[PDB]
Amino acid sequence: IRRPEHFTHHEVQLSDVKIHYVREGAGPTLLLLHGWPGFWWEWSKVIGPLSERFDVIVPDLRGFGDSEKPDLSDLAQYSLERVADDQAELLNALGIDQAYVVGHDYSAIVVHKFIRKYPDRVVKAAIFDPITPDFGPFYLGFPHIAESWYSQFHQTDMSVELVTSSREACRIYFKHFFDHWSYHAPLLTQDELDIYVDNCMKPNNVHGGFNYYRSNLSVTSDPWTDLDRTVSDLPVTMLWGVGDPVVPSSLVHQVPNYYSNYTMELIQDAGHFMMVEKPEVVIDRLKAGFR
């Protein structure tokens, strides 16, 4: 295990948020983008190996980890469009013209947006369990509400009050998602889960994360733009963990309408957290895809 403190930590002031990140390695820039309920450290198993070939950059999304939580009452500051803008600003701030970009979960949408809005800043991309503009009707539909109920729980003030009421309550809540969304539970050792809980229990982090659901996944939300509804012919490497119940491999059928130059591989013994559950697959497929 490589604990958070065994990386080098940076912060950079962007136009309306401070972004925290770790950075390591040499070569072309590889930008790794996390999801919920993790943060930058979910990539910790692959950063080292990948840094042998890349300048690996791993930020906390705004509202996550040690990155700034914008005005918690202003949901416009938690829109995914701005999170994609943050990545362009991050590259500008670091003097980087082009990067390889990788995302999943919320960052699957960030990458979707990014490669279309900033096409000249991408070399190639990778997405794990990709999410397209046609996700919405499936995800909040029947019977998938059996899996997506939590997106609506997060709309309530009570969810924040309950989940942050104690470290014990927090651990209980988040453990369910790590385990249920994985191919083989437990996903995490006790020490690893403690580190995720440490992060969730930082001031405003549970609230910050739930604001993503309020801004982008309320029943009146629409996080997608016209530009998002275009075909991209950028080379994209896609993986799916067939054990993912919340963004299931059936959703491959939504991909061809948005991409003309991709690969897809269904990983048989992985769920929603590919970089945690099958880190060697991630390292191998990215090194191969981005050769």
Add this chain to the structure above:
Amino acid sequence: IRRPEHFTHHEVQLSDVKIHYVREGAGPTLLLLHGWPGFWWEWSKVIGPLSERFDVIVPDLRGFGDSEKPDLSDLAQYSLERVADDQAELLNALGIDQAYVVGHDYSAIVVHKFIRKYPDRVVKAAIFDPITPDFGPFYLGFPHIAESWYSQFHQTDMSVELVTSSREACRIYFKHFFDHWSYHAPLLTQDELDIYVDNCMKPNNVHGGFNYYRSNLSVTSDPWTDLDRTVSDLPVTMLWGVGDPVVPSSLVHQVPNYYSNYTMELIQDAGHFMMVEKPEVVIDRLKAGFR
């Protein structure tokens, strides 16, 4: 306030469960049936006044309050059809030929079932915010999942673990439903909420209640029978609290397909807990309806 201990408590052994109830008054029998997340005591404001005209009987549903929790692993023992059977058995056990029956929430379904399955055991009925066989597609549909998410949360083991992890967690969770489902929050005084929490924290009561959702409201559940899909011409008094967001007054449109002899009244300053929020309305309308 009339605390639980200021009533007379009974238990009776039915064919496969022990049912706890309180009983008070003289006259025709009036059977009052509670919902989730309450228990018999939610009727405590109206029992006394109604007992001036009726033999008021108020049981805990199986799986609730001080009634027996059947085998927690056997969801068939938490089907609403059996809960309706329990009411027929209760009347048999007490030597009662016919009763006036009143329900809401889960007991709206119990009464729906009861008056059709045991039509000769009913004088007249009343339902608050009634639920019909056509409820399902609306309730788990879009956008109502913003309100019904909790029915799916309850499918998880983690929900029980979290909500029972401490009295504080329990209070936080249940308070949301009392307040959000009411017309004007707070619904309850601190002492009143403590009493509901005391009950929820009794061994197996949170689990017992969540089993109702697992048996009757999973995405593969079907609690309705062919007999339920028949028109009843029994006199039924119906009330709706227009402040009810989870079973909203729009659902009046589903009632005419199932009833030919009813009244309906929309109460302007009540939500989901009519007997708690507007007890004088309940007393008046039942005394009038059942004259």
Add this chain to the structure above:
Amino acid sequence: IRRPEHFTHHEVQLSDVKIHYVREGAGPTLLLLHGWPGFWWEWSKVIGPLSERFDVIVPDLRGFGDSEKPDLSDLAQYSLERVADDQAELLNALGIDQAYVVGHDYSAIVVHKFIRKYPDRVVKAAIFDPITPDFGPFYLGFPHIAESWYSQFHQTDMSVELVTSSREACRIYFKHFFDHWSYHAPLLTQDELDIYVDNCMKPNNVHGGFNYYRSNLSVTSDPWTDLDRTVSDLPVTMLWGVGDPVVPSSLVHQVPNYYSNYTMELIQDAGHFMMVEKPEVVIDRLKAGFR
């Protein structure tokens, strides 16, 4: 029986029609609005009793009874929107700021329109067997044409010629509707039917009534406005006669889209003419509803 001549008769000149009415009693103003094939006198059983608590005003609609028949060739003068305007003008002319208003049949639409167009002139309203903007497709649909055929018969010149060809033909025709639309035929004694026939046989009254069908119920008619398609939160007392075959109690399902503050009661032994068949119910429910 209280014959027409045993009331006090008035006429008032409104902006484009003379309206005939009877008036009786003291208290808040209660405006009672008749339908087809009756006239003001259909209310004759309840006027006296209601006048003990209200200033009861009962007009003939334009085109009916002793009220003026506008230009029989001008269907715009028989639109229901103008009939609703007539009621506002009547109140103005009598120096009345606000009234309780009651309607059924055609006057169900008049009241629908009135309470939305002149909301400041209503205290509370009542409608019997209410008709909403969604009536049309049901009423002229299949199989309801078995009941609504007469609305299309009335489009023909031959219908007027036939029905007015003799007092005997007139009696034969109208008796069918009084009896078939009631819960228990005969609706009327011989003397009562003679009085309705006397009125129908007045010059232009059959034609006047049929013009309502030509203006508002032809296959190219549209009597509803945008304003009519709004929700009203005025207190409205609604009754349905379950024996009504032409505006059946199934149509309760159309009401919730237009009203948020109402009561509904299905009367088991009444049809389309509640004030004729169950006058004591009408008196009781209006006195109660408008207390």
Add this chain to the structure above:
Amino acid sequence: IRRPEHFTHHEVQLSDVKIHYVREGAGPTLLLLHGWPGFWWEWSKVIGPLSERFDVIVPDLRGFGDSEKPDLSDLAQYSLERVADDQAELLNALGIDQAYVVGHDYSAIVVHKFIRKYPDRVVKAAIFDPITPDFGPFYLGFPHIAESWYSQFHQTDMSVELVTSSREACRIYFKHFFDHWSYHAPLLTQDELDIYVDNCMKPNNVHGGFNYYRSNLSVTSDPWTDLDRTVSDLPVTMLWGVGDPVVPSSLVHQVPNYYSNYTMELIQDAGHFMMVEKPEVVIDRLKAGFR
């Protein structure tokens, strides 16, 4: 004009009805079948001319004219299937192996049925304004109820009472249909209309005719058989009067599904009564079609 008494009148006892007919001429047998509200005499203008080339046989349908009215309470005896059977029996009784058959209105259905059920008894057929098994949804649909309302009026006892209440009422009623269904009103001279009224006023004839509507055109009627829903390749000559509003020329589109060997001609100045309004067209087209 050739009055009824200027023909030779016959009656024949068939298996369950007595059928009246007139007969004239020599050659192949030509069977002419009338509709509502006429009887055999509507063919009176063409019988003479056609008898120069054919053995013309013109019956009253059961329930019409001077033919027997079966048990007026037994609607099964007014089904169109039996009326088609009557034509086969008529031919048998007269020792006729094959005939040319012509129908319209109700007899359009009779001929439809006849040529499929008794195909070996037909040489060729002709239908004016033909009616197929797909008629129903159009005819009782919206907006055609503006034209078909009378089929539902006839379901009522009051319709018989009203229309037979006097010769004057009878004349008024039937004149509407002769005139409105024709291309150019008036269809008839005064003397001609008097003859139709004489026939309608014969005992039970209005009732008999209305029973056709009750048996075959109620909202729960189904006069068509499986055999009727087959394609016929018999030679069929079809005419349409474009002035026919009740069976309009748009209904040509329903014909190709049922016929593979036909002609169609739209007559520009005729309505529903081709043999009355354009007798020379009828004579010419039948002589030509049946050469």
Add this chain to the structure above:
Amino acid sequence: IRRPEHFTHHEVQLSDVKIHYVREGAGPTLLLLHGWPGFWWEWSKVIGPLSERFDVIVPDLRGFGDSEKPDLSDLAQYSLERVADDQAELLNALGIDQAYVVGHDYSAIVVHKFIRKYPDRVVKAAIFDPITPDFGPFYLGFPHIAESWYSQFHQTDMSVELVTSSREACRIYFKHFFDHWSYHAPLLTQDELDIYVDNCMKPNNVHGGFNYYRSNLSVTSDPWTDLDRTVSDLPVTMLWGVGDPVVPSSLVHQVPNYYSNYTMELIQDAGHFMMVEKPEVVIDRLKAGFR
């Protein structure tokens, strides 16, 4: 047989094409319009007989026969709208105010267009196996692609290369359509087929014909105008060959939406080439229809 050289041949310079035609007879002008894969000579059996009563004019369509092939790369010059314009120009050029016009196949569309765009230049019209604006979805639909495949073959350059590769290849190809589209194959004698092949093998004639398919029957083509979607009340004589598999007699159902003054006759032993397979029927029906 009347060979091409036994007619009198003309050419006239119209505004953007030279049109070749033959002309014969005296009387009102009768304009006969051919289809694919023929040319003017397909009418050769009926021209003589018809010339006894008419001034018969029979042109090659632009792109066919000896008429000019416009710029083969410019599909706008092969639109059917311009082919209809050519007929108006032809009449102008010959000093003819009005003509009887007859078409089938592609010329069914030409006549459809012509009688609506130049209504004052038509006396009466005739169409064989008529084609309306609603043809498209049927013709390129399933299962009719089993018959319409050739319209898509013609989109390819290879079709021209193959079909013109030799006289033998040409004969093989076109013979299929003459025979398969007829009621009884063979349609043609050997000498007659040789004459059609002679014409197809003229420079650019196969290409010219295939351009009709490219301009008017590609999957992105739309040859119809708003004016084409109007009802015509011009007298139109229509025939159908029931043996036509490519424009089948079922399509009669599309005709009533576009015509209010027509006749239709299904010819039992004819297919797609009525003037070739049943010339005496054509002569008789046109002489009769245009009397």
Add this chain to the structure above:
Amino acid sequence: IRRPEHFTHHEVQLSDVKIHYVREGAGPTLLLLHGWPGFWWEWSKVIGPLSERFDVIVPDLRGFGDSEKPDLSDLAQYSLERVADDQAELLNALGIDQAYVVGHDYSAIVVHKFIRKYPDRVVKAAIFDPITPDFGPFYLGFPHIAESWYSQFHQTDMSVELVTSSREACRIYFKHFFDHWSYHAPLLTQDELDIYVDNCMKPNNVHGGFNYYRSNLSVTSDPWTDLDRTVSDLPVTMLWGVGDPVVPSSLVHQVPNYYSNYTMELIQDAGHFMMVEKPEVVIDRLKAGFR
């Protein structure tokens, strides 16, 4: 170029056909299955390289190449189900328990069928431009008939007569498909095309190939079984040539319903003939996929 004669040729007698094949190499068995309009030799560029790691077996499908043409009048002998059975028999006859199987075009269906019907005879599979049971409605739908027209041309006797009329006609026809279905035309050198034409011109080979279309792709054909409509969890390597217009890369969306364990890669500069246009990709991806 490696000409046909530079391979070793075999024939084996199976239960109802003689199958011709070439075979080369050592290792696990790799069975390569061709499509239309090729034969075994389309694999000629990859056989040698692949034989370094595999026992490569490459048969002509029944009805193709030098394999037997069953009774040309018996379409049941050209059903794809029997072609899949032939592969099981081939393996049995050669004493092979399991093979890697690769297909495209018609053999995409053969492999689909094979891996489900004979699951114990497959190690892993690969499909190029895969075809599933949901292909039909797309392929013969609109607008894809612009591409699929040839499947219906092949239903006609004339297609065989035309295409085999000379070597020149044959070359012209087949060249279109090699070129139009490829990413960059020309697909073939002149010598390579001559070899394909040599094969097509062998007795009955054009007819044999067209029989595949008659048996499996007529508008009344159904080549799929219930077993075909099942999910396979065999490892399958899939490639798509994005330049393929007849089986386009959009059809990836049909794959997830039938496979749970696959990879997909869109090749940017290949069309329908991956093994011909991008042989090094085929060699690399199969060696990698089947390691």
